[PDB]
Enzyme design. Structure first.
Site, PDB file in Angstrom:
ATOM      1  N   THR C  37     117.545 -32.029 -48.258  1.00 24.31           N
ATOM      2  CA  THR C  37     116.136 -31.603 -48.043  1.00 24.31           C
ATOM      3  C   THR C  37     115.109 -32.966 -47.303  1.00 24.31           C
ATOM      4  O   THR C  37     113.841 -32.416 -46.738  1.00 24.31           O
ATOM      5  CB  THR C  37     115.366 -30.835 -48.745  1.00 24.31           C
ATOM      6  OG1 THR C  37     115.259 -31.361 -49.937  1.00 24.31           O
ATOM      7  CG2 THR C  37     116.151 -29.409 -48.699  1.00 24.31           C
ATOM      8  N   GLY C  50     130.256 -43.336 -45.982  1.00 26.54           N
ATOM      9  CA  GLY C  50     130.716 -44.332 -45.275  1.00 26.54           C
ATOM     10  C   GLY C  50     131.045 -44.107 -43.903  1.00 26.54           C
ATOM     11  O   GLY C  50     130.293 -43.623 -43.087  1.00 26.54           O
ATOM     12  N   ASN C  86     126.325 -24.784 -49.383  1.00 27.69           N
ATOM     13  CA  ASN C  86     126.266 -25.146 -50.818  1.00 27.69           C
ATOM     14  C   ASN C  86     124.926 -24.574 -51.184  1.00 27.69           C
ATOM     15  O   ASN C  86     124.039 -25.150 -51.010  1.00 27.69           O
ATOM     16  CB  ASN C  86     126.537 -26.712 -51.084  1.00 27.69           C
ATOM     17  CG  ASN C  86     126.343 -26.718 -52.466  1.00 27.69           C
ATOM     18  OD1 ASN C  86     126.115 -28.125 -52.920  1.00 27.69           O
ATOM     19  ND2 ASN C  86     126.953 -25.831 -53.466  1.00 27.69           N
ATOM     20  N   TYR C 147     118.604 -14.813 -59.000  1.00 26.58           N
ATOM     21  CA  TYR C 147     119.390 -15.002 -57.952  1.00 26.58           C
ATOM     22  C   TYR C 147     120.477 -13.962 -57.524  1.00 26.58           C
ATOM     23  O   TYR C 147     121.087 -14.192 -56.502  1.00 26.58           O
ATOM     24  CB  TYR C 147     120.169 -16.752 -58.395  1.00 26.58           C
ATOM     25  CG  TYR C 147     119.325 -17.710 -58.177  1.00 26.58           C
ATOM     26  CD1 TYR C 147     118.646 -18.010 -59.661  1.00 26.58           C
ATOM     27  CD2 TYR C 147     118.826 -18.781 -57.607  1.00 26.58           C
ATOM     28  CE1 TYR C 147     117.790 -19.237 -60.067  1.00 26.58           C
ATOM     29  CE2 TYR C 147     118.311 -19.923 -57.571  1.00 26.58           C
ATOM     30  CZ  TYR C 147     117.645 -19.935 -58.924  1.00 26.58           C
ATOM     31  OH  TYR C 147     117.006 -20.882 -59.109  1.00 26.58           O
ATOM     32  N   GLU C 223     137.087 -12.865 -48.622  1.00 25.50           N
ATOM     33  CA  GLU C 223     137.555 -12.927 -50.025  1.00 25.50           C
ATOM     34  C   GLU C 223     136.462 -13.650 -50.826  1.00 25.50           C
ATOM     35  O   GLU C 223     135.833 -14.681 -50.447  1.00 25.50           O
ATOM     36  CB  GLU C 223     138.825 -13.564 -50.250  1.00 25.50           C
ATOM     37  CG  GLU C 223     139.474 -13.615 -51.595  1.00 25.50           C
ATOM     38  CD  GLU C 223     139.426 -12.348 -52.232  1.00 25.50           C
ATOM     39  OE1 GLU C 223     138.874 -11.372 -52.576  1.00 25.50           O
ATOM     40  OE2 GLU C 223     140.909 -11.916 -52.687  1.00 25.50           O
TER      41      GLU C 223
END
EC number: 1.1.1.100
Lengths: 228, 224, 231, 220
Positions: C37, C50, C86, C147, C223
């Site tokens: 962020t 890298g 994520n 959550y 799934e």
């Protein structure tokens, strides 16, 4: 090649999913023992496994046959590290059809898992994977199987053994190739992916769950059905 | 009194959940036949049911016992409209005990449901409710039971028969404060349920008020 | 190197699960773009990736930021083949105590953002008849009720989207981690809730993600793969 | 009269399921407050409720205003009952509207009535799911929220459940064999059948049921 040194017992490895699983584990270094209900079948399995394994006759119902097969495997390769179990109108089926399905598809998994757990827990490492029935049309045994696996998974998890289920959808096998075009179309219509799965796709999932890659995955039902 | 004219067969009605279910259906107008695994247990059931039913001996494991009981019920009351079907480490079980559990908690429901369906369907009305085992060697049979019910539910739904499962949690049926505390720690509600609470749920699913509910597993466990 | 030629966008790749996922995909041949962020956060990602990728600042809450990032990626690498959403680090709280502020922020960051990102990358996936969208559930902390809604909506959204884009060769899956390694009496309290008796490693979630992103899971979609040790 | 002395707030009680629920709770002794988005709607609700309740205008997305009115005329709320295109086609606008109207609003309402329930150590929160893709996330988020909230307030004597109806003969369904072919019962459910289920979960006979999703869909 991440299975070197591991011994895998795959029941019903004559063809389709069972054979794809046996060949995949073998191709990745495992010594594989595939089973069939007849001696000829067993020899056919030995013929395709070559130096990577052997085929043995096994009747999953008979507790005597199980003990016999496990003894042959111990005498030739060692202890089993990976176990892969490969298996009418509900108000008109006879008690025989009912018992046969419970016996074959449910109780047998219980008897086999029981027979190989001792060695797994002693070595503190193990994998038990059960393959659910392949979709053939548009239940108690299948559901009981999943319930048994989740329960067993919780019981042996601390010893380094994982117990999982792979639930294939409409996979391309003899049984689906023997269906009529209308039947296939009806089922395929129920499949978002718009195609049938290959036997190898179920084998890839099994190979993944059997590896060290999934040591933290247990009591899970992995569906491989293209979206069904 | 919404069960007036209905006949209910409740297995394992000797005490606890089974008896609460039998007394509740009877209190709401149903003719109740409760069963026990012996004639002695059966008489006890007859005594508490009084003019609202009778207790019969049923060996849910013998096809002949099932047919025999259903025949007695027909002679006396009529066809059954409502059917209510009422430990150790896994790897330490012997084939024999695994077979007894499958055969007693799974196959028996299949045999009983099969025995009473033909009549329900001809009548275009029926209820089949199975009560799950009250809280590892029963997980398979329990899960197979739910799978069987959902499957059967779809098969007979069009003829007005509903097939449901009621899954009770911890039900008061002694222990030391430490054991009891260990149990309570597993229930968000913070208390044990009463046998009557499972009976209320069964009574609801058996009524006409639940005609559109089928293939469902109703949990009564305080959020466990 | 079975991800050679593929471009993967991994959000929240600064630390933990996100970074393990980014390093794993990179180690297997993918060109990885990890996001953070802040600008300094993106540079840290750029340092560990890298020559196998780059770090970019992304604010999933901002639709202007999303297209900006996708434009930079398309200018330096190409079209995104693999998208990994994520979840950030969850900081638990009680439902009846959370304010509109938090509630809205969790929906916006944990549910709506996945919708906006998936929407932004789907066309390029469909023209190629190939794509992977994997969302990582909020890891169970040390009771994660705040959550819960967003989490369930996320799974519902994925199953639904999976069904919509499956015929185009795109799979949409969810990986639901359990207790992950990220104070011993509290330790035993957590461990007691895990049959396996230990916490999972960030790499274990990454192995599962790598599997679902590969060609071997082409028939797996809609799934939810739980990696929780039996919990 | 299982509900004598109980106050129930039913949102979207204008017609169909909402009205069946409001009439059923009222018929069983509860003081019912049904809500609508407009005044003709609120007035229409007061008309059919009569001496058993009142209708109020309520934009769930206003809440404190309505709760204040109920609080002055009847008391605290004991029972709370909360009542299309392809995804890649949705615009940000539609997506947000659905999340707020069907998910966030339940959160805001449940939050507004919990204190009272907690203090009384008795309460019922029932959410009615969407009748039968763009609502896929809100519906699933709703169930997730309910299960989570259920565990949080269970020790306080409050149950939180969800009733998920299948194809319920409404006005849409009035316009077929295609959906019927999807349901084993071979018929559509009545609005009253969802109301019976709600009435059951709201009663004392369902005190040990919480965090449950009760499907009423004919085996669908």
């Amino acid at each position: 090649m991440n299975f070197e040194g591991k011994i895998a017992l795959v029941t019903g490895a004559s063809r389709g999913i069972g054979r794809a699983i046996a060949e995949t584990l073998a191709a990745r270094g495992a010594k594989v023992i595939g089973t069939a209900t007849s001696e000829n079948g067993a020899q056919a399995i030995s013929d395709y496994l070559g130096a990577n394994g052997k085929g043995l006759m096994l009747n999953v119902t008979d507790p005597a046959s199980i003990e016999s097969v496990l003894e042959k495997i111990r005498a030739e390769f060692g202890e089993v590290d990976i176990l892969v179990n490969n298996a009418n109108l509900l108000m008109r089926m006879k008690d025989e059809e009912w018992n046969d399905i419970i016996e074959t598809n449910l109780s047998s998994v219980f008897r086999l898992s029981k027979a190989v757990m001792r060695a797994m827990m002693k070595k503190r490492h193990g994998r038990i994977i059960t393959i659910g029935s392949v979709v053939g049309t548009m239940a108690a045994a299948k559901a009981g199987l999943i319930g048994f696996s989740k329960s067993l998974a919780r019981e042996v998890a601390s010893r380094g053994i994982t117990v999982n289920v792979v639930a294939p959808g409409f996979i391309e096998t003899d049984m689906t190739r023997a269906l009529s075009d209308d039947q296939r179309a009806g089922i395929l219509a129920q499949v978002p992916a718009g195609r049938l799965g290959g036997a190898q796709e179920i084998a890839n999932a099994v190979a993944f769950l059997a590896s060290d890659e999934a040591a933290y995955i247990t009591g899970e039902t992995l569906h491989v059905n293209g979206g069904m």
